[PDB]
Design a protein around this ligand. Structure first.
Ligand SMILES: [Mg+2]
Ligand SMILES: [Mg+2]
Ligand SMILES: [Mg+2]
Ligand SMILES: [Mg+2]
Ligand SMILES: [Mg+2]
Ligand SMILES: [Mg+2]
Ligand SMILES: [Mg+2]
Ligand SMILES: [Mg+2]
Ligand SMILES: [Mg+2]
Ligand SMILES: [Mg+2]
Ligand SMILES: [Mg+2]
Ligand SMILES: [Mg+2]
Ligand SMILES: [Mg+2]
Ligand SMILES: [Mg+2]
Ligand SMILES: [Mg+2]
Ligand SMILES: [Mg+2]
Ligand SMILES: [Mg+2]
Ligand SMILES: [Mg+2]
Ligand SMILES: [Mg+2]
Lengths: 45, 392, 240, 322, 117
RNA sequence: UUAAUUUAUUAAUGCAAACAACCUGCAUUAAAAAUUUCGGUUGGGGCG
RNA sequence: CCUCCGCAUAAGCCUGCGUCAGAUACUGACAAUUAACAGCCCAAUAUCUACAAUCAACCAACAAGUCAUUAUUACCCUCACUGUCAACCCAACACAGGCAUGCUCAUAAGGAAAGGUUAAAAAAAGUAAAAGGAACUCGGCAAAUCUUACCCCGCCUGUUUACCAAAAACAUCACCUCUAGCAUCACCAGUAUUAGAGGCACCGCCUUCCUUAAAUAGGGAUGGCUCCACGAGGGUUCAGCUG
RNA sequence: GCUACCUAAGAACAGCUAAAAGAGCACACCCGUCUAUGUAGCAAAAUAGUGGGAAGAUUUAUAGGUAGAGGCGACAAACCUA
RNA sequence: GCUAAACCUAGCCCCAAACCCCACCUUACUACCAGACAACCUUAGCCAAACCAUUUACCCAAAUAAAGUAUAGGCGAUA
């Protein structure tokens, strides 16, 4: 019954975790800054 | 109460920086940076000129500056105008007297069985069945498809009478023709910009139906008025317009004389379809507009009683219900409510068939109504054929 | 939330306007009013509550022809499409308003009392005392705000100086300048009380949804309680 | 999944490919008041009619030639009705669809879970001829059934995909322009208008001069095969019950100025591999080169009017059932 | 869920796949009805010379002598292109020598560069 | 919760402040809350 | 011999049983999905638009149902770009689960329940059963058959503890109580026949015996009441049926 | 991207009975009454049969919204990525 | 005798010194149309006080010393 909580959709993915949404708020900008500081290959989703 | 809430109204611009209020000093703005910064003054940008010039990025000038703008406001009737008072309003606007039923002159053209089409009912039934059931792979064709089809097939069926009537060779049904006619009514200038479709043009003008005595008898008839509804209601009040009378064709066009205007209300949705009264009003207005354009082209742009009245017919249909109109324009002196008046014979709500069953209704595994038209009325097609044959 | 009100249209029109349901939610997206949600899709017909609105470049009392009386999904009252001169507008229909009727909208406060015919609008100063009225303004030219629901009728209780006392349907007295316009008669659809919903589904169609947790305060709903005084603390819960 | 065969096509040598798909041999050749009426229709659509909105060259076909072709067909049918009684009772269709679905050849599924399995190659033509004429009595043959011709049907070694041709899965329709209940189920003449995408000017710019006649010929073959096949399948024939009489239809294809004329005789519905293994018959399409009806139109004058094109149109309209 | 693979036009739903391109430069615009109008001037016209009679070849004979690389400089170009005329006219308004005060008005403006390659 | 401590915040008033609205400060009363605690002995609990 | 399967679209995935060469649908190399289908649009400013749908014709309504165009001013070039494969996606898996839509209604499509043997026990599912027919058991659970009658609770249809509770609980029409006389972000583009909150429960009215042979079981001699209908609710019963 | 509720714009609902129904029987579809199997399972809630609803207070795809003392809740302290 | 077992530098730690072509904010890595939203606002709590409620050290701009002194503090933990 459970386990399939991920029902993928690229529209939702980009609108929820994308670069534009991350930059849309100061908190998300700090998210990107933390990922850059850590050296993440993928900064946003 | 004001319409449009503040939250939806355009936001007020932020207050100007106080630095702009100090006379002697030049504010330091981010204009030089070429991008916004929040700690510098907001520049005051001069309005940009080269913008609203490119064809794909064009802004039309204000209506006041347009070439045809006029302080006097015309009232235009176009194809998508729906008169509130309907036939009464159209009669007042066109200075017309209504006569119930088609005239005997045209009705007699189909009394003799020679004009009756061989296998007339069979062919008309096939036309109705093709339009309403057999037209497409879809089970139930929509009105947008079966109204033009029914009209065109009926016109072809009538045109088949070229055998008996060689005069039918001097006519042609043009499509997308557009006419424009302007005239005054009690200091109100009214225009009709008829677009519609299926103008049946003939090489010869239609014979007049009403005699001089009847035309003069129209003087006594009083033009019915409606209050407090102004006759202007539901007409597009426009200040941009052209007072030229356009018949829709360049000079020298063969088949110059309008014969029949085929107006069809083919909208799938009832609210997008004209009411029968409003359709009859539109027929009156378009027939009057075409007749008036013809009169202004022939006898000049002078308000006068026409020595030779101009006759224009019209058939307005929704695919099932038809309305037949013969309009005799016998005066271009429209401004006054007194004098000889134009006159229109109208036959209303002539239904070609009562209903059409695209699917066989089955109750308790028993077929009650078979597929096909029910209540077919050949009389309406007789009237249609009479209108087509008039003048031939 | 990215909520923009649907009430953005600026120009009055007769065409029904597509209205967006709210669900009881603020512009913040949080529930502000409980029990709202769903229901039949509706279109809004802009009602002109200022009955004395003379047309452009026109003035003085004017008459109007009732084109039709229609059910309004957004009101208890049924509305009337009414046309005057070269314009059409939606107004609130009175109890006996019929298609083809004639309506008078006047700003003239006659020295004598004007004969109050149901459905027409006169300044409250011109009406006889004791007349039933509806669509009452609070200020001259403000627009009708009171006595608008189906079957409601205020009473012109009194007229002294330039001030009239109206009895609102809640049986509360209201003072209004006599120059404010009101229409005579009770609002239409008088049987709105007697309508029986019959089943929960009909309310769901009307857009009312069963909703709980309507208070959001700690402990939920809590009726007011009288806090005893120190001398009275000894008698609050005397045992049997 | 079936190949969408487009009568009016941009593909090169599509006439040859359609000949293969159809089992049609193409044969070059054939098996005053009217002039005034034609000039009147031309001038009415080009000069006399007043256009409120400017006519753009990207819509010139649809706003000029389409009404022109409609007027030609309607007025000519009316005028020739005395000279052709069958034409009086005929149904004149304006842009009514013609659908034909058939199976031609086989293919081994190349990839997937169905790889290596045999699948019939299915084709669908969804045409919408500008005008068409439907009669209740079949036209006469142009040549006997089982008529052998030395010219051989082109052989295609490549998949239909190589000709730009794509597969879709949707309703399989076999339609003559009206439902089977319609008594007027046989075809007399189709009138086709090439779209602006297939302008002669654009075709000349992008291709040879032979590609214009290829476009005309491919449109003819596809459209007329579809119409005659639909007529035959309305009469009840199919691949396993082949037609006992040939089915005939004519077509004229115009770009607005240039007209070409085609006659088509369908002798086979047996197009599947099983029904075509020992099938000697083959469908036939006689065609003419595209000729300009007029050279140019200047203001109020039609310069270079060709009477022979109008005579060919009249001849098609005058063809009668026996 | 694949954060590492490059975002291309093959990935999203129909709107995404239609909207994203592959870097090809635009050739025109879209009108009503999604009809594409192609602007001729937007299409890069290849200016291909006539190679008939050309003596140079893709390769150079190894017999060619070695030389020292001397990258062209503004000073060198000025000396070899303007200095002779300047000296000849000084011994005996800089537009006469080739200088232009502004690039505006030219087809091939040097800055901001407005030509391909 | 009638356990203890508060009322910072809102809402009312009052007094000053700015000359009715609006706003600041200081009080009082509430609403809403917030923070915190659960002594010992007697199989357990009630009452002790 | 088997399948509510299959084929397509959408969404998702992203080369994931094509060829060749090495290994034991893996590795490497090579190849491939070609636009007409689909996506990617609109030159604006104004002004316009009451008249559902349901074969839309009668009849039938209430829950009242986007369909946005035209006039003037601008406008001339023309088919670019992108998706197109697969045995596939979400469930850690080559997972009996989840998975929108169009068509086929048993397939023209798609598949294989048995690695080989033997024929023990125990276990699971199924089939048949003498005579009997609930004596089983907490309980007719399950199975087989097909019926009867009555109580308690809840008016009813619905909702709920995703994953031990589907109910008598929650909701619900109906009714009652309390609060509110009013505009431009909810309530509401509403206005006391309205709105919000709480309670209650549709509605309507009045004010020792029987059952069995044995029966801790069952049924009957503002409130009080009234069970029409309904229920995988909780008890009881006739008859039948049955491992 | 689960789930709860909501917003916008969609879609589905055979056949029979009945006749405009929160109607009856019963597919698709939704659910989850009872039993059995399974219990590191096919499955971190499934399977088989049985059963309830199945034109509605229905089911459902897409996009959006409400966020932690908060949301949402036909109140089960239920649900808000096992 | 299998599985294994062993290895030494890949680098790292602490100091010192020194101040360190094209594409991409729209669905990022997307050649190419009407902007305007544009930022600033005491940390709290864990914890110690053997509960807890006032209170309970925390990049300071010279180390040491004055000095854990003066002071503060439910005058107590402590500061
Ligand atoms: Mg989902
Ligand atoms: Mg799992
Ligand atoms: Mg097996
Ligand atoms: Mg085995
Ligand atoms: Mg037995
Ligand atoms: Mg027993
Ligand atoms: Mg028994
Ligand atoms: Mg026992
Ligand atoms: Mg049982
Ligand atoms: Mg219940
Ligand atoms: Mg139930
Ligand atoms: Mg549970
Ligand atoms: Mg359960
Ligand atoms: Mg018992
Ligand atoms: Mg059904
Ligand atoms: Mg039901
Ligand atoms: Mg719920
Ligand atoms: Mg509870
Ligand atoms: Mg402590």
């Amino acid at each position: 019954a459970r386990g399939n909580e991920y029902q993928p959709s690229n529209i939702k993915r980009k609108n929820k975790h994308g670069w534009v949404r991350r930059l849309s708020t100061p908190a998300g900008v700090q998210v990107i800054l933390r990922r850059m500081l850590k050296g993440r290959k993928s900064l946003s989703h | 109460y004001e319409w449009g809430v503040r939250s939806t109204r355009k936001s007020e611009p932020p207050p100007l920086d106080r630095v702009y209020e100090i006379p002697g000093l030049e504010p330091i703005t981010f204009a030089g940076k070429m991008h916004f910064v929040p700690w510098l003054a907001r520049p005051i940008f001069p309005p940009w000129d080269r913008g609203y010039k490119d064809p794909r990025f064009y802004r039309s000038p204000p209506l006041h500056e347009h070439p045809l703008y006029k302080d006097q406001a015309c009232y235009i009737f176009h194809h998508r105008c729906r008169l509130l008072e309907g036939v009464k309003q159209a009669l007042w606007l066109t200075k017309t007297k209504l006569i119930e039923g088609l005239p005997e002159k045209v009705l007699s053209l189909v009394d003799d069985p020679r004009n009756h089409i061989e296998n007339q009912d069979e062919c008309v039934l096939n036309v109705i069945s093709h339009a309403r059931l057999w037209q497409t792979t879809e089970e139930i064709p929509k009105r947008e498809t079966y109204c033009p089809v029914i009209v065109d097939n009926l016109i072809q069926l009538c045109k088949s009478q070229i055998l008996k009537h060689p005069s039918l060779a001097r006519r042609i049904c043009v499509q997308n023709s557009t006419f424009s006619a302007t005239w005054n009514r009690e200091s109100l200038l009214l225009q009709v910009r008829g677009s519609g479709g299926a103008r049946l043009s003939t090489k010869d003008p239609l014979p007049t139906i009403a005699s001089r005595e009847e035309i003069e008898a129209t003087k006594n008839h009083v033009l019915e008025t409606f209050y407090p509804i102004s006759p202007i209601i539901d007409l597009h009040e426009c200040n941009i317009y052209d007072v030229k009378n356009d018949t829709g064709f360049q000079e020298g066009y063969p088949y110059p004389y309008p014969h029949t205007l085929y107006l069809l209300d083919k909208a799938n949705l009832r609210p997008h379809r004209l009411q029968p009264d409003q359709l009859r009003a539109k027929m009156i207005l378009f027939a009057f507009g075409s007749a008036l354009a013809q009169a202004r082209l022939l006898y000049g742009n002078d308000a006068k009683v026409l020595e030779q009245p101009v006759v224009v017919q019209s058939v307005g249909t929704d695919g099932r219900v038809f309305h037949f109109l013969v309009f005799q324009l016998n005066t271009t002196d429209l401004d006054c409510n007194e004098g000889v008046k134009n006159l229109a014979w109208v036959d209303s709500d002539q239904l070609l068939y009562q209903h059409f069953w695209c699917l066989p209704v089955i109750k308790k595994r028993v077929v009650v109504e078979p597929v096909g038209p029910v209540g077919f009325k050949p009389e309406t097609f007789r009237k249609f054929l009479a209108l087509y044959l008039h003048g031939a | 939330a990215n909520f923009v009100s649907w009430k953005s249209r600026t120009k009055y029109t007769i065409t029904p306007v597509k209205m967006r349901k709210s669900g009881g939610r603020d512009h913040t997206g949080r529930i502000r009013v409980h029990g709202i949600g769903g229901g039949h899709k509706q279109r809004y017909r802009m009602i002109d509550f200022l009955r004395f609105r003379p047309e452009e470049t026109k003035s003085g009392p004017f008459e109007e022809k009732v084109i039709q009386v229609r059910y309004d999904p957004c009101r208890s009252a049924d509305i009337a499409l009414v046309a005057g001169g070269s314009r059409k507008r939606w107004i609130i229909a009175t109890e006996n308003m019929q298609a083809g009727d004639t309506i008078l909208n006047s700003n003239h406060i006659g020295r004598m009392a004007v004969a109050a015919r149901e459905g027409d609008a006169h300044p409250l100063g011109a009406l006889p005392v004791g007349t039933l009225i509806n669509n009452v303004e609070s200020e001259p030219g403000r627009g009708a705000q009171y006595i608008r629901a189906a079957g409601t009728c205020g009473v012109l209780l009194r007229k002294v100086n330039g001030t009239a006392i109206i009895q609102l349907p809640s049986k509360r007295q209201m003072q209004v300048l006599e120059t404010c316009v009101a229409t005579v008669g009770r609002v239409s659809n008088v049987d709105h009380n007697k309508r029986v919903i019959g089943k929960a589904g009909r309310n769901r169609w009307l857009g009312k949804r069963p909703n709980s947790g309507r208070w959001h305060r700690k402990g939920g709903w809590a009726g007011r309680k009288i806090r005893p005084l120190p001398p009275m603390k000894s008698y609050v819960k005397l045992p049997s | 999944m079936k190949y969408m065969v487009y009568p009016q096509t941009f593909a090169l040598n599509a006439d040859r490919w359609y000949q293969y798909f159809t089992k049609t041999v193409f044969l070059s050749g054939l098996p005053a008041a009217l002039r005034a009426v034609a000039c009147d229709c031309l001038l009415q659509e080009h000069f006399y009619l007043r256009r409120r909105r400017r006519v753009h060259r990207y819509e010139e076909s649809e706003v000029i030639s389409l009404p022109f072709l409609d007027q030609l067909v309607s007025t000519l049918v009316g005028l020739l009705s005395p000279h052709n009684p069958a034409l009086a009772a005929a149904a004149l269709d304006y842009r009514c669809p013609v659908h034909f679905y058939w199976v031609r050849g086989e293919e081994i599924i190349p990839r997937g879970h169905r790889r290596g399995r045999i699948d019939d190659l299915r084709y669908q033509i969804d045409d919408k001829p500008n005008n068409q004429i439907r009669i209740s009595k079949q036209l006469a043959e142009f040549v006997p059934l089982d008529y052998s011709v030395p010219i051989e049907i082109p052989t295609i070694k490549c998949k239909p995909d190589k000709l730009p041709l794509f597969k879709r899965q949707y309703e399989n329709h076999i339609f003559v322009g009206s439902k089977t209940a319609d008594p007027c189920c046989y075809g007399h003449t189709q009138f086709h208008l090439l779209p602006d995408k297939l302008r002669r000017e654009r075709l000349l710019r992008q291709n040879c001069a032979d590609q214009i006649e290829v476009v005309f010929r491919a449109n003819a073959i596809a459209s007329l095969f579809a119409w005659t096949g639909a007529q035959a399948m309305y009469q009840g024939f199919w691949s396993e019950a082949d037609v006992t009489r040939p089915f005939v239809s004519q077509a004229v294809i115009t770009d607005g100025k240039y007209f070409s004329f085609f006659c088509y005789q369908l002798n086979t519905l047996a197009l599947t591999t099983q029904a075509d293994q020992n099938n000697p018959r083959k469908n036939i399409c006689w065609g003419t080169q595209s000729k300009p009806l007029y050279e140019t139109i200047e203001d109020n004058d039609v310069k270079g009017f060709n009477d022979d094109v109008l005579l060919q149109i009249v001849h098609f309209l005058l063809n009668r059932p026996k | 869920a694949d954060r590492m693979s490059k975002w291309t036009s093959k990935r999203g739903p129909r709107s995404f796949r239609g909207r994203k391109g592959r870097g090809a430069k635009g050739i025109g615009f879209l009108t009503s009805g999604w009809r594409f109008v192609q602007i001729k001037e937007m299409v890069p016209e290849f200016v291909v010379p006539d190679l008939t009679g050309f003596k140079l070849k893709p390769y150079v004979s190894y017999l060619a002598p070695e030389s020292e690389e001397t990258p062209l400089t503004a000073a060198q170009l000025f000396s070899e292109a303007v200095a002779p005329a300047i000296e000849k006219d000084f011994k005996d308004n800089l537009e006469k020598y080739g200088f232009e005060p502004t690039q505006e008005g030219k087809l091939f403006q040097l800055y901001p560069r407005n030509f391909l390659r």
